[PDB]
Structures are given as structure tokens and as C-alpha cells.
Nucleic acid binder design. Structure first.
Length: 772
RNA sequence: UACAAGAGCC
RNA sequence: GGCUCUUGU
């Protein structure tokens, strides 16, 4: 039924200079054997995943000769149990009773092992060979979890990651926090091998040491003898918050050991048993995190403990590939899996960054220095005659101050005359309001008093719903376009920092700031073209931005509100109806090429977002004007993945980060062959960072060649408003993120009546922006 | 919310 | 979705 699939890729890329890169991939030889599948029905399910792993280890170490023998399984810690060899258990569902011995009451786990399937590895063989259209994910998770279970004992796995132990090292941080610098282990398909994907993770952990030192260090009370007088109930309530939910165990029973469960306060387990453990006998076994409670400065320095440069990331993943030694891993090499520790050789395509045209008096050309360029006193295309405008500071009055607002305004108009704006005069009204209570009479006063008001400036303290109320009022009620600055960019200013604000408020009303070179433009630009971008984000968010003209700066935005915990677009018809009628109003020309975008989508949701975000635009385009179906170039970006690219022996080291140069498209040998995709990194040296941006283009209507698509997408990265810094993701996707957050705030002041009473967006703002 | 880049947070 | 820091033009 789901025949509305992404098309196969028509042609590989050949443009630009070809580079031989070293990706974040590790070559490995995968055999043709079939991995079997078994299910674990665990009773009870109140125990966590680590307790399940310990009990499965107990029944291999206790019932070796009956279920397994020398053939041994591999384990996914919640339900799944895979094995490369044929286990001697078969169809027989043994409801094995795990008997951990105890003080009278033994810990009884009722687990049943049942054969489910024999997973054919020839399916993934046909997948990476290119003769299958789509790569299966169940078999890629089986190949992932082949290499989990032996490192599951040494590194306690949560999510799809690993949490390393202190291999001869130590780390204190304070407040009961330590960093467990493991790694995000993954495997991704390719052409030749299903090469491994290792990225460092480096998260926090709540250690594996008993609760005496915990009450020594977390409550900062190392001795209770000095605290002779007891405190109030607050330490008891904090004890109830923190101590409950952390598993302890006994060690006062000789060789007989077991693991206990904590649900009451320390009143371990039920109150009807005879095993109660005070603070002097509790021992916490590893595997406990995510129930953390501390201030965020430890989180920030823990983020610093992960923040590593790209050559440092090369050395760290190379050290991890040496020290963990997955070829020396016993059950992995018993499973027929061996890896190649050496970094791969991948063939890529570095791109010439396109020369842009800015208009104005000179109309000369500026070229990017590997994805980055500055205007540097070069006038843009269409400046806008700003005559009357207003300031409505909705921060408290001490923050937005008068002489600093005057110097911000003056340096804004002076750098905007340097960049080519005819800003006429000071703003007429500079009012200093308080908050979300009284937003409406002064907005009515600004609408009725100053006729033809062009822009209103709003100053905000931070994340607060006076912003939410002013955005809802300004884009639904009466209709002035609201641009918002915080004082953190007003108090400290640099010419870049306010030049980019003047070019945000340039396009806020509407105008053209940049145009690509007609010689440098792809042949899509010889026809009219609509650049579209979607975003899914307390009801939830539907928000889509489309452009206005062939000159790629003028856009406009739509907002709707949808039900929560849903990441689909369902009201797309009204959105792109408004976008294409505003295109028709803007240029008197129906655009011929649709360039769709969406930022931040899950990898498994692609067929459903294809189903609801291209059939909806098709039933909208039959509703706008008859015999009008422009070709859609649907590009779905990812921006969060564990797949990196590293420079070839530092041949072209750029920046202090040491990452790869900008535009380095890689489609062969590490990207998925069988579908329509490419990697792209349009970045520079920032913070110490290794990254691409996976532009998995999900639909091309007329099936243009991907050589044109990648250079058009690189240009569209260099058609942002803030194109002064490399924006890495083409412009309507990031506009869509802004307008998505806008729809989010549009409904916070409060079935769907509260939603339906504040969605009637005004006609005086849908021609303008409310997001940049 | 000048904008960007991304480690997780919890 | 959620923030919280670091480095930047």
C-alpha cells in the first residue's frame, strides 16, 4: 500500500574537485551465515535492563550444557536474543525459572526462550550490493547488537550507546557526578562492506560506589556525629527524592549474592519481607544514571569534556579502535565478524563556493572563502524605504535603556546606509512596557495612531510568555511585523553583530538582499522557482516557509497549531496555498520548480512524511490554479547523526577545529547507495567540531541529475539572510525552524477551542516575516 | 529572542 | 520538544 516511495538515485555526482577522504567508518568483513532470533518474555518486567543482562549471564553460567553449549547467544537487553550459531534450544519454549539464592526468599525470575525467526543475512547482502532498493533496519540492528553484548559487560549500555568504565583512570567532579566516556556504536550501510560507525559519546554517570560516600558527598555531610541536632523535614523530603529509585544489593551473605530493587524509603523492596537494608550495608551496582539532580555548571563542564577537535576526535576514535580491539573480541570473532582498524578511503567531491552578486551602487561580486564571506561595505540588492517605525520594549524598563537604544538605532542605520538602506528618521514611538498583561491597548494605539506603520521593535528579557503573547497578537490580532532583539546583543555590539540585524530587518518587511550570479546559477534558476521549507516542532507545531521570487531572499511564512506529540504536517494545503498566492502577488509569475526542505526528522518517519507532505501540496496545487503542478525537489536534511568525515592526513587543514573544507559532498562508499542522498559539510572551524549535514533528498519530480542538485543546494545554503556565516542548511529549512518556534509561542498564554480562538492570522503580516 | 556549530541534558 | 555552555564571523 505504501508505493509512494522515494525514487532511486538517477546518477552519481562528478562535479567539483574529487577528494579521497577518510570517513568515520571502519571496514569489516561480514559473512553469509544466518543469525537466529529468540524472544525473552521476562516475568517480572519491574527489573531494569542491566538486571536482565545479569540474569541471562546467570543462566548461561548455570545452564550452559542444556540451552547453549559452546554456541552462545548475543543479547539485546530488553526483549531480543540473537545468535549467529544454531543454538540447541529450537522450537522448545523452556520457561526457565532463574533461582538466585537468598535469605529464605529466593529471587525468582520467570523467563521463557522462544524461537521467532532465522534472520537471513542475504537480504542485507542484496541491500548493500545495490540490487535491493531499501536497506532493512532489523538486520542492521542485529549486526549492531552482535558487537554489543561482549562490550555490554565492560561498558553498561543504555540507548544505542556505550558507557565506558575507568580503565585504570579516575575522575572526580563533585556533587555525586562522574563522566563515563563511552561511545555511540552504530552500523550504517554502504557499497562494499557494512562498515562500522564509531563516535565518542562521553556522558555523565552516577558511579558504582556505596551510599555511605554518597551521603558524604551529595548532602555534603561526611559525618553525622557533628550534626547532633537533627535538621528539618527538608532533608527527609530530599532523601525521598534522591535515594528512592537507585538499586542497591547485599554483600553480607558470603558467596551467596543477589540484586535488590528499591521502591520505598531505606525500605528496600516491599515492607512485608524480612530484608531491610540500612545505609551501612547498601552497595550500588553499576548501570544507574538519568535520574540525576544537580546544577547545570557540572553539565556544562561535562559538555566541555566531550568538546574535542577533529584531529583530537581522530586520535580518540583511533585509540578506541586500538584499545577496545574488536578483532581480539572473542565472541565477535566467533560470530564470523572481523573488522579493519584502519580508517577508510572514501571518494568525495569538494565544491567551488559560488560567487554572489549584491546590488546597490557598485553591483560587484564577492566570492566565499570556503563557505564564508563578508559583505564588507558592499550594498545589497533592494533596500527598503523605512519611513515610520516603532520600538515596543516588552522587557522591564531597566534593561532596554534610552541612550543605548539610541546608539543601537543610530549604528544600525549607519551600517545599513553603508549596506544600502534609506532609513528615514528616528522611530516615532519608544514605549517601555512591563509584561504580558497590558500588550493590547498600546498595540491598538500604534495601529490607529501612526498610519502605515512599517516595523515594530520589541525587546525581551529571555524565555518568557510576554514574547509568546506579543507574537500571537502581532501575527493574529491586528498585524504589525514584530522584530525582536535581546539586550545581550544591544549592550555589547560589534559591526557584524548589528549589520546582520539590519539585514534581518531588511527582509522582515520584504526585499532582496542577495542574488546568485546568472552565470553561476544552475539551470533551475532560468525558470521561476519556489524555495520551500517545512518544520514540525501545550499543543504542537505546524510551520512552513516559502519564497517569493527568483531572487532568493524574499520569503514569507505560515503558522498553524496541531495536537501534541505529533511530527507530521497535515494542514499543508492552507500553508502552501497562502505561499503560492503570495508568490503570485509578488512576481505575477507562478513558479515552476519547488525546492522543499525540512529540518530535524527521524529516519524512520520518512515514508509517512512523504505521504503527508507531498500529497498535501499536490491537492493544494490542484486547488490553487488548474493545470499547475510544479516539479518538487524534496530535500530532507538530518543534521543529527553519528557519522563524520575526516581530512586525509591533514592535507587541507582549515580553521582551529581541523574539520574538512566546506561543500565536501560524499555520496559514494559510505552513504546509502540504493536511494537518493548525499552528505554535505558546508562548515568551517568552530569550537573544535567534526560534522557533516546529511541531505537525504527524498523526492525529485522530474528527476534532475544529482550533480545539479548538490551545487544548487550548496548555493541555497549561500542564500540565507545571514549568509555572512556558513549556515550549513539551505535557507527555507532554517526559516521554517524560526516560524516553527513562532507557531509554538503563538499558543502558550493559556478540546481545541483554545486552539481555534487564536489561529486566525492577520492579512497584514503574511506578506511579511515574523521569524528572522 | 544577531545568527551559526554541536555534545548531551534527565 | 526540552536547555547550556564553548568557539566564532
Amino acid at each position: 500500500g505504501y508505493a509512494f516511495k522515494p525514487p532511486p538515485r538517477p546518477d552519481f555526482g562528478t562535479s567539483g574537485r574529487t577528494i579521497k577522504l577518510q570517513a568515520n567508518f571502519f571496514e569489516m568483513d561480514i559473512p553469509k551465515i544466518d543469525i537466529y532470533h529468540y524472544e525473552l518474555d521476562i516475568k517480572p518486567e519491574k527489573c531494569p535492563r542491566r538486571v536482565n543482562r545479569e540474569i541471562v549471564e546467570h543462566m548461561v553460567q548455570h545452564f550452559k550444557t542444556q540451552i547453549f553449549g559452546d554456541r552462545k547467544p548475543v543479547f539485546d537487553g530488553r526483549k531480543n536474543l540473537y545468535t549467529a550459531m544454531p543454538l540447541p534450544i529450537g522450537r522448545d519454549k523452556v520457561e526457565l525459572e532463574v533461582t538466585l539464592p537468598g535469605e529464605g526468599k529466593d529471587r525468582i525470575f520467570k523467563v521463557s526462550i522462544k524461537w521467532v525467526s532465522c534472520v537471513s543475512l542475504q537480504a542485507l547482502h542484496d541491500a548493500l550490493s545495490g540490487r535491493l532498493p531499501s536497506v532493512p533496519f532489523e538486520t542492521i540492528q542485529a549486526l549492531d547488537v552482535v558487537m554489543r553484548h561482549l562490550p555490554s559487560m565492560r561498558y553498561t549500555p543504555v540507548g544505542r550507546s556505550f558507557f565506558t568504565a575507568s580503565e585504570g583512570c579516575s575522575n572526580p567532579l563533585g556533587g555525586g557526578r562522574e563522566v563515563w566516556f563511552g561511545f555511540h556504536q552504530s552500523v550504517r550501510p554502504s557499497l562494499w562492506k557494512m562498515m562500522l560507525n564509531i563516535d565518542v559519546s562521553a556522558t555523565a554517570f552516577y558511579k558504582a560506589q556505596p551510599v555511605i560516600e554518597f551521603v558524604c558527598e551529595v548532602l555534603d555531610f561526611k559525618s553525622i556525629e557533628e550534626q547532633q541536632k537533627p535538621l528539618t523535614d527538608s532533608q527527609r523530603v530530599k532523601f525521598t527524592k534522591e535515594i528512592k529509585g537507585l538499586k542497591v544489593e547485599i554483600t553480607h551473605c558470603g558467596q551467596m549474592k543477589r540484586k535488590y530493587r528499591v521502591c520505598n524509603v531505606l525500605q528496600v523492596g516491599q515492607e512485608q519481607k524480612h530484608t531491610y537494608l540500612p545505609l551501612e550495608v547498601c552497595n550500588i551496582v553499576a548501570g544507574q544514571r538519568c535520574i540525576k539532580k544537580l546544577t547545570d555548571n557540572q553539565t556544562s563542564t561535562m559538555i566541555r569534556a566531550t568538546a574535542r577537535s577533529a584531529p583530537d576526535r581522530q586520535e580518540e576514535i583511533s585509540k578506541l579502535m586500538r584499545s577496545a580491539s574488536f578483532n581480539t573480541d572473542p565472541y565477535v570473532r566467533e560470530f564470523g565478524i572481523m573488522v579493519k582498524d584502519e580508517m577508510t578511503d572514501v571518494t568525495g567531491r569538494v565544491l567551488q563556493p559560488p560567487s554572489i552578486l549584491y546590488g546597490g551602487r557598485n553591483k560587484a561580486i564577492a566570492t566565499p572563502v570556503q563557505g564564508v564571506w563578508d559583505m564588507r561595505n558592499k550594498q545589497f540588492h533592494t533596500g527598503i524605504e523605512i519611513k515610520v517605525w516603532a520600538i515596543a520594549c516588552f522587557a522591564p524598563q531597566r534593561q532596554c535603556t534610552e541612550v543605548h537604544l539610541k546608539s543601537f538605532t543610530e549604528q544600525l542605520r549607519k551600517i545599513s546606509r553603508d549596506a544600502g538602506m534609506p532609513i528615514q528618521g528616528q522611530p516615532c514611538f519608544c514605549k517601555y512596557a512591563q509584561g504580558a498583561d497590558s500588550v493590547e491597548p498600546m498595540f491598538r494605539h500604534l495601529k490607529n495612531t501612526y498610519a502605515g506603520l512599517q516595523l515594530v521593535v520589541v525587546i525581551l528579557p529571555g524565555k518568557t510568555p510576554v514574547y509568546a503573547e506579543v507574537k500571537r497578537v502581532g501575527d493574529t490580532v491586528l498585524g504589525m511585523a514584530t522584530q525582536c532583539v535581546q539586550m545581550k546583543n544591544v549592550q555589547r555590539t560589534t559591526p557584524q553583530t548589528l549589520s546582520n540585524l539590519c539585514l534581518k530587518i531588511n527582509v522582515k518587511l520584504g526585499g532582496v538582499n542577495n542574488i546568485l550570479l546568472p552565470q553561476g546559477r544552475p539551470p533551475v534558476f532560468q525558470q521561476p522557482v519556489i524555495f520551500l521549507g517545512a518544520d514540525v516542532t501545550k499543543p504542537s507545531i505546524a510551520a512552513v516557509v516559502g519564497s517569493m521570487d527568483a531572487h532568493p531572499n524574499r520569503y514569507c511564512a505560515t503558522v498553524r497549531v496541531q495536537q501534541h506529540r505529533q511530527e507530521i504536517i497535515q494542514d499543508l494545503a492552507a500553508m502552501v496555498r497562502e505561499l503560492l498566492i503570495q508568490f503570485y502577488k509578488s512576481t505575477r509569475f507562478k513558479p515552476t520548480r519547488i525546492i522543499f526542505y525540512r529540518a530535524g526528522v527521524s529516519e524512520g518517519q520518512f515514508q509517512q512524511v512523504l505521504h503527508h507532505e507531498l500529497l498535501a501540496i499536490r491537492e493544494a496545487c490542484i486547488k490553487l490554479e488548474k493545470d499547475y503542478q510544479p516539479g518538487i525537489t524534496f530535500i530532507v536534511v538530518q543534521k543529527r547523526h553519528h557519522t563524520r568525515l575526516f581530512c586525509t592526513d591533514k592535507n587541507e587543514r582549515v580553521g582551529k577545529s581541523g574539520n574538512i573544507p566546506a561543500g565536501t559532498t560524499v555520496d559514494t562508499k559510505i552513504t546509502h547507495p540504493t536511494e537518493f542522498d548525499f552528505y554535505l559539510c558546508s562548515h568551517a572551524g568552530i569550537q573544535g567540531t567534526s560534522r557533516p549535514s546529511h541531505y537525504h533528498v527524498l523526492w525529485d519530480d522530474n528527476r534532475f541529475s544529482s550533480d545539479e542538485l548538490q551545487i544548487l543546494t550548496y548555493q541555497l545554503c549561500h542564500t540565507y539572510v545571514r549568509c555572512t556565516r556558513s549556515v550549513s542548511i539551505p535557507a527555507p529549512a532554517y526559516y521554517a525552524h524560526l516560524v516553527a518556534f513562532r507557531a509554538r509561542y503563538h499558543l502558550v498564554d493559556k478540546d481545541h477551542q483554545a486552539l481555534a480562538k487564536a489561529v486566525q492570522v492577520h492579512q497584514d503580516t503574511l506578506r511579511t516575516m515574523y521569524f528572522a
